[PDB]
Amino acid sequence: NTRLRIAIQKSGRLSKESIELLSECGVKMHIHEQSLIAFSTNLPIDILRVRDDDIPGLIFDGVVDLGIIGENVLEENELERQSLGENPSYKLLKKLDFGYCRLSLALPQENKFQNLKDFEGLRIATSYPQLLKRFMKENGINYKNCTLTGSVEVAPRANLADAICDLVSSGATLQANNLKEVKVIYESRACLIQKENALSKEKQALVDKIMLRVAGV
Amino acid sequence: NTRLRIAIQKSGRLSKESIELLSECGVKMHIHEQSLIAFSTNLPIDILRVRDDDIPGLIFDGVVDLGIIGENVLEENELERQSLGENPSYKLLKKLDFGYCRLSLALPQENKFQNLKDFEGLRIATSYPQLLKRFMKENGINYKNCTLTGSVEVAPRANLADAICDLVSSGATLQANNLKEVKVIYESRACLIQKENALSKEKQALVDKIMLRVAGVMQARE
Ligand SMILES: Nc1ncnc2c1ncn2[C@@H]1O[C@H](COP(=O)(O)OP(=O)(O)OP(=O)(O)O)[C@@H](O)[C@H]1O
Ligand SMILES: Nc1ncnc2c1ncn2[C@@H]1O[C@H](COP(=O)(O)OP(=O)(O)OP(=O)(O)O)[C@@H](O)[C@H]1O
Ligand SMILES: [Zn+2]
Ligand SMILES: [Zn+2]
Numbered sequence: 001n002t003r004l005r006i007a008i009q010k011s012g013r014l015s016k017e018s019i020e021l022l023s024e025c026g027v028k029m030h031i032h033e034q035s036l037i038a039f040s041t042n043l044p045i046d047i048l049r050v051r052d053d054d055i056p057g058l059i060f061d062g063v064v065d066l067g068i069i070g071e072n073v074l075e076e077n078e079l080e081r082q083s084l085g086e087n088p089s090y091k092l093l094k095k096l097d098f099g100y101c102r103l104s105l106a107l108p109q110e111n112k113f114q115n116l117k118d119f120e121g122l123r124i125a126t127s128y129p130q131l132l133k134r135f136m137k138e139n140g141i142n143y144k145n146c147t148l149t150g151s152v153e154v155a156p157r158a159n160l161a162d163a164i165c166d167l168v169s170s171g172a173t174l175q176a177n178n179l180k181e182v183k184v185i186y187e188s189r190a191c192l193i194q195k196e197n198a199l200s201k202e203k204q205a206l207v208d209k210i211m212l213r214v215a216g217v
Numbered sequence: 218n219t220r221l222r223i224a225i226q227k228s229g230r231l232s233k234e235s236i237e238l239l240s241e242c243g244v245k246m247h248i249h250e251q252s253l254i255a256f257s258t259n260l261p262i263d264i265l266r267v268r269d270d271d272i273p274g275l276i277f278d279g280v281v282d283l284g285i286i287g288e289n290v291l292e293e294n295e296l297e298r299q300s301l302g303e304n305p306s307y308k309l310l311k312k313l314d315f316g317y318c319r320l321s322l323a324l325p326q327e328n329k330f331q332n333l334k335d336f337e338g339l340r341i342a343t344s345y346p347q348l349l350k351r352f353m354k355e356n357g358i359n360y361k362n363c364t365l366t367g368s369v370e371v372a373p374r375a376n377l378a379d380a381i382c383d384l385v386s387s388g389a390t391l392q393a394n395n396l397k398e399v400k401v402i403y404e405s406r407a408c409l410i411q412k413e414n415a416l417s418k419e420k421q422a423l424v425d426k427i428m429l430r431v432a433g434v435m436q437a438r439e
């Protein structure tokens with residue numbers, strides 16, 4: 001249809017700043033508890049509120065025009081799609097001023113970390129199995145996977161794993177679980193991305209305008 | 218690492234009945250409602266309480282010994298793993314008497330369904346993209362995919378997709394969203410599975426004991 005589709009995180013760490021950025025680019029809308037879609041009141045724009053993990057896929061499959069997502073989630077999902085034999089593509093428009101975090105290897109507080117080789121043959125729990133797999137291959141370290149979507153930091157205490165690969169900024173969660181960060185494998189921020197296949201002149205024009213305004217802020 | 222590990226859904230449509238099946242089979246336990254780990258108080262068993270989507274991976278990777286999971290989630294993740302060039306493997310111990318649901322192609326109620334080839338070219342929203350992909354390749358209908366983890370039934374109303382492939386039980390939600398069920402592609406129930414690699418003799422003996430009890434419990438509940 002005529003309206004531009006912009007996917008953002010429904011509720012989590014990027015939601016507040018995604019909405020703030022959209023407001024500053026002249027997109028007026030009301031966010032309440034709409035399950036999926038919020039309609040801009042001043043421009044022909046639909047805001048899709050989704051789980052963050054779905055946003056790369058929506059961009060790859062051409063379902064939405066624009067997307068605001070963390071680079072970690074984007075790349076996790078690109079790698080998955082590549083390992084399926086697919087050719088995911090997207091246009092990067094801008095790296096943004098929020099969503100700063102890093103994906104790091106971590107061990108229990110009372111361990112003797114000398115070297116990356118100390119991870120050899122360990123069981124490593126993570127929500128980012130593709131990112132971890134690529135890092136370990138690149139550095140020639142063999143390991144055992146444990147994929148968990150939540151409570152990753154509880155995995156060593158639960159005896160499910162010897163170590164974790166998790167997102168960190170402040171270190172507070174690691175500290176709470178008596179773990180210590182030992183090696184960063186990936187640095188991330190929020191980015192604005194666009195699908196591959198060409199937008200309408202109507203829609204592309206509207207994107208260029210928002211983009212002009214994005215640069216402004 | 219010698220306590221038997223069993224993964225179950227932490228909170229959701231299988232969580233209550235998984236815990237109750239365990240109690241019915243004589244596994245006494247205390248649960249702290251927000252926590253990943255719980256322990257049997259009378260048997261050497263850890264109960265790991267996780268997101269259901271993680272259970273098949275945990276079994277395939279040998280991280281736990283047993284799991285209770287919907288057949289739909291098991292199959293979707295098996296297909297995913299196979300399409301990634303992996304070799305996911307598990308033992309099916311038992312099909313269980315709860316978790317009944319079905320995965321169904323569905324269209325707006327105000328919409329003429331003559332034929333399964335009506336889906337040709339349609340954008341289809343789903344949480345089960347591998348299961349959809351297999352069914353559509355098998356039947357020869359081409360389509361465009363839209364993967365959504367939740368709110369799938371709202372996608373047509375939101376003009377993200379023309380049709381959905383949706384998990385339903387009662388069938389009430391679809392009516393609520395002004396959509397009609399036109400073709401079942403998968404029928405699911407809860408199952409009990411075990412990892413591929415052999416358990417120690419003592420742990421396999423505990424599993425054999427649990428299995429006899431599950432069969433008796435299931436007889437008694439008819
Ligand atoms: N401590 C942090 N500070 C800033 N940004 C973070 C931090 N941790 C994670 N992020 C970024 O924000 C994104 C969303 O984080 P959040 O914890 O809300 O994800 P989620 O729980 O997977 O969300 P959803 O419910 O949509 O699945 C992460 O993928 C990452 O890009
Ligand atoms: N009416 C139903 N709709 C969806 N799933 C159902 C239904 N009835 C039974 N189930 C079963 O319950 C499983 C759990 O789905 P649930 O609705 O609890 O939410 P979820 O988001 O999958 O849970 P989690 O938070 O663990 O990811 C399904 O995958 C399926 O096997
Ligand atoms: Zn309002
Ligand atoms: Zn997420």
Ligand SMILES: [Zn+2]
Pocket residue numbers: 268269270
């Ligand atoms: Zn789930």
